[PDB]
Structures are given as C-alpha cells and as structure tokens.
C-alpha cells in the first residue's frame, strides 16, 4: 500500500549523525568542528541509502544543536561546508572561516532550526556504496590495501561549524543533524549488508 512503496520508505528521516562538543571541549577547546562527509559510518541511516544505489536526489536536512543535557543556551554559530577541495580551518582564527565562495549560513541557537537542501554533487552518475578496485594505480602493497574500499567519487568535503568568538565557548553544542529525503527515484537496489566490523570507515 502507500507505506510499502519506496517513497514512503525513503521519506522517513532519521538522525544522520551527531557529535557533541563539550564546553570544556577537550576535543575542541576551540570547539571548531571539521566534520567528515561520511554519513556512511553510521550504520542505520546509511544502509537504507545503500539499499538503492542509484537515486536522483534533492535532500533536505535540518540542523538542531544542544548540549549533551539537551539544554539549550544562547550562542550564535556559523555553518560551512567548504568543499573537500578547500582548506579546512585550523582553528578559531582560521582563515577559511571567512569564506568567500564557500557557502555559510549563520543562525542563532535561539533561531529556529534551519533546513537546507543539497544537490547530488558526485561527479559520478551516482554514489555507489560498493567499490571494487583502487582509486590508485600501481602495485598494491599490503599497507596499500587500506585503499581498496575507497571510492573517490563518493567522497564529499568536510563541514565546518565554529562558534563565533575569539574566546572559548561558555556552552557546548551537538551537531544533531537530521536528514529527510525528498521524493525519490531510485534504481538497481542492492541487498542490505550486515557484516563483522572490518573497520571504519568501511565500504559497508
């Protein structure tokens, strides 16, 4: 019926993934976040996406942030994903954060969560989970073997979020990214995989 159909299946949204940065923020005292593209590590969301290799996507995701408590506090954040191409900000001062080209949105914590959509970037027709081969040419040393999984096409740039201040933050924040899928066309579904955990990031 309606629910069974693909759109309903996809339409459901879940947490893409979240990170928490403590106020003390040993991890980031500066509290800059340079985030990997990889949704992929999170199993649950990813697998579903994996399920249909080929999709034409317009995707909207929402940003919500809170402390580990979930308490909100007033901070204003700036948001960016430069690309993978761009330099990634070293620190609070970091040059990149002033970003000409690289897109940024500024919203207050107080401000209601912001939602945006992103195009299907990949240079490849699609992002396919499985990759067979090496991004690189040459003899494959044992050490090299790490390479095997990677598919360069399905690789995206990092995200940067920094609380704006010379000083260090009073309060913590969590990325708590939510993604929802727009109406989807998908092709050539592939079976779900559950495996032992070879390692992350994993082609699975």
């Amino acid at each position: 019926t309606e629910e069974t159909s693909i759109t309903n299946f996809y339409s459901r949204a879940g947490l893409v993934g979240v990170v928490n940065m403590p106020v003390q923020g040993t991890s980031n005292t500066k509290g800059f976040a340079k985030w990997g593209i990889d949704i992929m590590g999170f199993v649950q969301m990813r697998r579903k996406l994996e399920l249909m290799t080929y999709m034409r996507f317009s995707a909207e995701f929402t940003f919500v942030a809170s402390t580990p408590e979930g308490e909100t506090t007033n901070l204003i954040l700036q948001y960016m994903y430069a690309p993978p191409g761009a330099p990634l900000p070293t620190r609070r001062d970091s040059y990149e954060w002033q970003t000409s080209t690289n897109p940024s949105i500024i919203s207050k914590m107080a401000d209601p969560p912001a939602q945006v959509s992103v195009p299907f970037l990949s240079p490849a027709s699609a992002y396919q989970w499985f990759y067979d081969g090496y991004p690189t040419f040459g003899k494959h040393p044992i050490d090299q073997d790490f390479q095997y999984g990677m598919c360069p096409n399905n690789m995206m740039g990092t995200f940067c979020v920094r609380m704006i201040g010379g000083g260090k933050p009073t309060q913590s924040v969590t990325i708590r990214i939510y993604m929802r899928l727009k109406h989807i066309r998908a092709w050539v579904p592939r079976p779900l995989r559950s495996q032992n955990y070879t390692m992350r990031n994993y082609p699975n």
């Binding site: 490849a124 067979d132 999984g149 079976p191 559950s194 495996q195 070879t198 992350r200 699975n204």
Partner: protein, 254 residues
C-alpha cells in the same frame, strides 16, 4: 516461458556461437540475462571520452577457456574477476593493456562433466561490486583488509572463507536476487549466461575496476557412491561481448 508445471523441450539443448568459438550443451536451463538487459555499445551521450573507441569485435569476442578447475565433493567456491581474466588471456588481454581504457560485457559459459545423480548442486552467480570483507581478526578490532591476491586473484578464483557470508555482509540466501542459475547438473548442465551491464561510468579504464566477479559455490554437498567417478570437473569459458577501448597508450600489466 515455462511455468512451474510447464516444460517444453529443446530449451535444454542450446548452442552458443561467438567469434570462431562454439559451445553446445545437450542439457541446459534456459539462459538468463541479467536485469532483462542485453549488452550494448556505450551511447554517444553516455561516453565522456571524446576518444574514438576501438572495438576489435571478432578477436575480442570469443570464448576463452581460461582455466578448468577440478571439483571436490565439497569445496570452497572461488571467484573469477572479469577484467583480469580477459586481460590475462590474449590477444584480448594484451589488447586491453594498450587499449587500457576498456569496457565490456561478456557471455559466460561454464561446462562440467555430468553425472546422473549430480547431487550437491553448485550455485554460480555474478555479483556486481563484489567487495570482500575481512574477519579483522574476528575480534573485529583488527580492522584489516583483504590481500591484493584475494581481491584480484587473477582468475585463479578465490576460495571463499565462509560461503554463507560470502565474506561480505550479504547473507548467502539473499544472493538469489542477483541473476544466477544453479547447477545440480541433475537438473541442467553447462549453464549459459549473458551479462548485461551495470557500469558506473560508461567508459572506464577498467584495468583497475572490475565490472564484477563470478562466484561458483555449491549450495549442496556432492554425494556419490564410491563406485561412481570421484572426479567432477568444471570448466569455464567466456566470450566478452561488445568491448571498446580508449587510452591507446602504453600497456601496463597493472
């Protein structure tokens, strides 16, 4: 055609012809073509290359009996990587290296000697984007990745560590979804398949990339009386279908 009840005749008998290669099997099951597609030449729109491809049709397209493998009553299945196998053989493989930007499909014929009982059917399937996964020490901590030899064994095949897993998350049983046919060989004999394309990029060098690999693993244990001939060989021959090349320049084994 046939429904479960319905059975025609001379479905089983078939001949395959390719450039100066022919195979016939008296007993067969109707050929399955993947995803209801048949191989084709990459479209102009599709092709980025802007380099005129070369298709040696005839030489390229032929059955090659790359290797024959013996069987065990139970044996680990092993995987044939498509790209390497062709490459290893020549002219086609040799042509490939120079030609290296390469894409193709192929028709696959696997033949075995038949025994009446032919219990212990073996299932063969090709899965696109076959990716291996390691035990990683079985701790899971180890986070180790598969050997080069393992990944592209070079058409030695690769014996499957754990068949159900297929050394990948995918459960074996689900595997059926991908097109395949099984040889009890009681039911059928040398199978015929033609492989339609899933190609991420309409043209790849494809030296690095493997379109897919073939796995042959018996679902069932073979069983025979002692008297019956212990040895049940399997052989594989394949002829690549439309193949095109670009990247004329120097050939690398890699």
């Amino acid at each position: 055609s046939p429904t479960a009840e319905a059975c025609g005749y001379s479905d089983r008998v078939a001949q395959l012809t390719v450039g100066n290669s022919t195979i016939t099997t008296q007993e067969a099951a109707n050929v399955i073509v993947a995803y209801g597609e048949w191989p084709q030449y990459c479209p102009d729109t599709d092709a980025t290359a802007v380099d005129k491809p070369t298709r040696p049709d005839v030489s390229v397209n032929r059955f090659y009996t790359l290797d024959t493998k013996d069987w065990s009553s139970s044996s680990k299945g092993w995987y044939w990587k498509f790209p390497d196998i062709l490459a290893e053989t020549g002219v086609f493989g040799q042509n490939a290296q120079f030609h290296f930007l390469y894409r193709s499909g192929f028709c696959i014929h696997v033949q075995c000697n038949a025994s009446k009982f032919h219990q212990g059917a073996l299932l063969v399937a090709v899965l696109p984007e076959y990716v291996t996964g390691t035990v990683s020490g079985n701790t899971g901590h180890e986070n180790t990745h598969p050997p080069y030899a393992a990944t592209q064994p070079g058409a030695t095949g690769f014996e499957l560590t754990n068949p159900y897993i297929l050394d990948a998350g995918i459960p074996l049983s689900q595997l059926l979804v991908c097109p395949h046919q099984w040889i009890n060989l009681r039911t059928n004999n040398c199978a015929t398949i033609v492989v339609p394309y899933i190609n991420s990029v309409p043209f790849d060098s494809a030296l690095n990339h493997c379109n897919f690999g073939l796995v042959v693993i018996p679902v069932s244990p073979l069983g025979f009386l002692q008297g019956a001939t212990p040895t049940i060989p399997i052989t594989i021959t394949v002829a690549p279908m439309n193949s095109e090349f670009s990247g004329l320049r120097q050939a690398v084994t890699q």
